[PDB]
Amino acid sequence: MSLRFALTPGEPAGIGPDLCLLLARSAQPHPLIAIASRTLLQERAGQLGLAIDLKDVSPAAWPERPAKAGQLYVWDTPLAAPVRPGQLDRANAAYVLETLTRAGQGCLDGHFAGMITAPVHKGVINEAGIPFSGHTEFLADLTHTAQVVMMLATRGLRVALATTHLPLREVADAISDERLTRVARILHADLRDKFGIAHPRILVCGLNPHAGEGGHLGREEIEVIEPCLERLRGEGLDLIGPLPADTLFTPKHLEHCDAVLAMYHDQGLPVLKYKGFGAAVNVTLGLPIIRTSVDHGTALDLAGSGRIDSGSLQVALETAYQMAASRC
Amino acid sequence: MSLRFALTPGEPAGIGPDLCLLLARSAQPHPLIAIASRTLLQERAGQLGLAIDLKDVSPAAWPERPAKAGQLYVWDTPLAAPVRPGQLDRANAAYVLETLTRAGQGCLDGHFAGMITAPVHKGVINEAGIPFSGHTEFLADLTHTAQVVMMLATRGLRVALATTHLPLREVADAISDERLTRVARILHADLRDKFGIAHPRILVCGLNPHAGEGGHLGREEIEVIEPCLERLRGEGLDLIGPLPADTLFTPKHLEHCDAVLAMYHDQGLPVLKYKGFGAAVNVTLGLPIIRTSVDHGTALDLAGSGRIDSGSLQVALETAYQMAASRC
Ligand SMILES: [Mg+2]
Ligand SMILES: [Mg+2]
Numbered sequence: 001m002s003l004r005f006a007l008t009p010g011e012p013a014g015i016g017p018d019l020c021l022l023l024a025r026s027a028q029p030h031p032l033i034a035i036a037s038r039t040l041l042q043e044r045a046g047q048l049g050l051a052i053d054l055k056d057v058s059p060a061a062w063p064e065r066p067a068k069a070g071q072l073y074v075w076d077t078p079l080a081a082p083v084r085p086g087q088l089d090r091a092n093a094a095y096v097l098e099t100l101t102r103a104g105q106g107c108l109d110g111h112f113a114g115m116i117t118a119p120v121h122k123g124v125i126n127e128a129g130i131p132f133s134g135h136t137e138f139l140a141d142l143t144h145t146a147q148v149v150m151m152l153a154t155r156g157l158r159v160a161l162a163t164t165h166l167p168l169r170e171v172a173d174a175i176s177d178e179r180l181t182r183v184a185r186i187l188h189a190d191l192r193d194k195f196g197i198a199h200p201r202i203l204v205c206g207l208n209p210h211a212g213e214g215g216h217l218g219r220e221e222i223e224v225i226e227p228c229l230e231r232l233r234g235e236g237l238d239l240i241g242p243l244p245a246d247t248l249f250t251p252k253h254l255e256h257c258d259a260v261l262a263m264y265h266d267q268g269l270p271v272l273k274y275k276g277f278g279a280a281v282n283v284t285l286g287l288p289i290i291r292t293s294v295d296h297g298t299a300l301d302l303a304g305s306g307r308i309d310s311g312s313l314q315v316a317l318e319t320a321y322q323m324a325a326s327r328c
Numbered sequence: 329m330s331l332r333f334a335l336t337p338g339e340p341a342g343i344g345p346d347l348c349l350l351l352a353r354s355a356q357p358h359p360l361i362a363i364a365s366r367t368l369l370q371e372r373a374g375q376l377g378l379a380i381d382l383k384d385v386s387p388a389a390w391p392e393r394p395a396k397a398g399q400l401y402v403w404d405t406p407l408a409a410p411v412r413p414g415q416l417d418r419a420n421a422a423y424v425l426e427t428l429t430r431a432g433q434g435c436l437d438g439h440f441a442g443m444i445t446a447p448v449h450k451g452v453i454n455e456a457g458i459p460f461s462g463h464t465e466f467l468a469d470l471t472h473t474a475q476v477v478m479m480l481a482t483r484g485l486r487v488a489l490a491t492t493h494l495p496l497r498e499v500a501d502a503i504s505d506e507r508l509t510r511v512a513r514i515l516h517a518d519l520r521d522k523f524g525i526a527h528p529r530i531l532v533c534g535l536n537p538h539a540g541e542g543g544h545l546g547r548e549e550i551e552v553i554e555p556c557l558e559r560l561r562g563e564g565l566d567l568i569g570p571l572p573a574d575t576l577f578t579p580k581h582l583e584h585c586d587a588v589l590a591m592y593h594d595q596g597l598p599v600l601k602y603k604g605f606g607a608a609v610n611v612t613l614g615l616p617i618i619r620t621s622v623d624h625g626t627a628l629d630l631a632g633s634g635r636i637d638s639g640s641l642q643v644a645l646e647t648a649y650q651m652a653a654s655r656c
Contacts, residue, residue, distance in 0.1 A: 167536050167547075210493070219495075246597035249598040271602050278578040
């Protein structure tokens with residue numbers, strides 16, 4: 001449809017290119033424009049044994065229909081140095097951010113209805129001397145978004161996180177009224193606007209096991225979480241909880257739920273990965289644009305070996321398509 | 329050779345008595361002795377519209393054969409006050425602990441092969457002025473066991489915990505070389521001795537997300553967990569990890585392990601409950617006796633209603649029977 005999507009293979013030495021090529025074996029419901037190096041993809045394809053019709057595409061006139069099953073659109077972006085699967089090279093660090101910038105600005109301009117990102121390697125970018133806090137932070141800065149919320153999803157289950165990549169010992173003190181308020185509002189606003197859910201029903205996990213057990217297993221629920229959720233409900237948000245995480249994450253309770261708000265990383269991702277057989281899409285909430293991503297790393301050691309699972313990227317693409325439909 | 333098992337209905341006002349009465353409709357493979365008030369059981373039976381014959385048991389003659397279908401052995405233990413389903417009464421707190429003591433001491437004295445516990449209400453016990461941390465802690469003290477290991481299980485999945493009922497902020501400092509080492513050894517030994525697994529394959533979770541990510545998200549894996557597990561692997565224990573929790577909990581890996589060892593409550597139980605809530609048994613490892621239990625609450629508002637699921641307690645019974653046969 002008139003809805004175009006930018007696909008960023010990410011770190012050239014990683015499986016990003018691989019995955020994108022593998023998913024090029026099937027025709028897409030929409031024109032999927034891969035912003036990367038033609039040569040990169042060509043070689044990776046040859047290395048994988050696969051055969052894809054890397055069809056060049058120019059900003060002068062974007063495509064209109066999806067590439068044939070075995071073809072992949074490519075908005076060529078030059079590498080700085082040749083590539084070898086599984087071998088990082090700081091010389092190509094700028095090339096990575098270039099693809100991300102093209103993809104992000106494209107969405108901001110309206111040429112792209114949304115973007116899907118394959119794995120990037122933070123370490124090699126920092127080694128090139130390029131300021132890079134991370135994949136998500138980069139896009140946030142590009143879109144001038146001060147606050148974002150990380151929401152993981154698999155078919156039939158969405159889990160937003162109050163805290164993300166932090167040592168477990170730093171979690172408890174990070175749970176504040178301010179933090180929960182910011183996260184809840186963004187989660188609500190986006191499920192409504194980007195997923196077409198008028199009144200999102202969000203189940204909220206307690207921080208402590210058994211959600212603090214009436215205050216006998218931690219005080220955070222009584223002192224912080226409960227008062228916060230109470231105020232938010234009065235403001236219109238349908239937040240249910242705090243509920244014990246191991247009670248909430250069950251078919252019964254999830255049946256009438258649009259998303260689960262977990263307090264920290266390992267409290268919500270295991271169930272999601274279990275359910276989806278390791279396939280999960282990472283959605284950045286709070287941005288003016290639509291962006292999804294796979295949750296796994298670059299897997300340098302598996303690059304060009306074909307021994308990879310494209311489930312995550314597959315789910316990442318579908319989620320992006322759906323969001324655009326509901327309205328960006 | 330004859331094996332007797334103690335059964336404790338637990339909190340009188342809860343559904344424990346109900347569950348024990350319902351399961352009594354089927355003849356057991358071993359004599360199952362309910363340690364509770366005979367009058368309580370007879371009244372709850374009438375309340376439920378169930379026809380169960382209560383056969384008195386004397387410590388002077390522990391029955392060798394199982395009771396008949398529709399019959400339940402009862403070692404009468406007096407209540408302090410009449411019981412009203414759904415209504416807690418601190419006057420009966422001592423009664424609860426008395427039945428637990430009789431069961432535990434009965435195993436320690438060699439009369440019982442194991443014990444199965446139905447739900448108890450910790451709150452009413454503490455309100456009666458009796459220090460009680462919970463079921464597991466009470467038994468560890470009664471048996472003078474310094475370290476026990478809580479393991480939840482359902483068909484196809486067993487999850488042991490390094491720490492249990494602890495506020496999240498206390499978890500990190502609790503993961504010590506001493507604790508982890510004891511916990512791992514107990515899990516390996518019991519899977520070998522009580523579950524008949526010659527060479528247990530155990531997947532171990534890191535404390536931090538991504539298992540610390542090379543020490544970038546916490547140093548515990550590097551400084552404590554890795555060294556400990558490495559030490560034990562050098563002793564023949566097939567422990568794999570530490571690995572990211574959301575990686576270990578994928579079908580791909582679970583299919584090849586005998587148990588998962590999570591560092592804390594909400595890191596491992598959500599997946600277990602998602603997979604087998606309603607057929608999940610809580611097994612206390614490390615005790616000099618065998619004890620299993622359900623992991624649901626007393627459901628005070630369902631007492632006397634008959635709208636309950638005895639599936640969990642059923643699995644708890646079968647698990648104790650199997651463990652005892654395997655050998656305490
Ligand atoms: Mg629990
Ligand atoms: Mg992660």
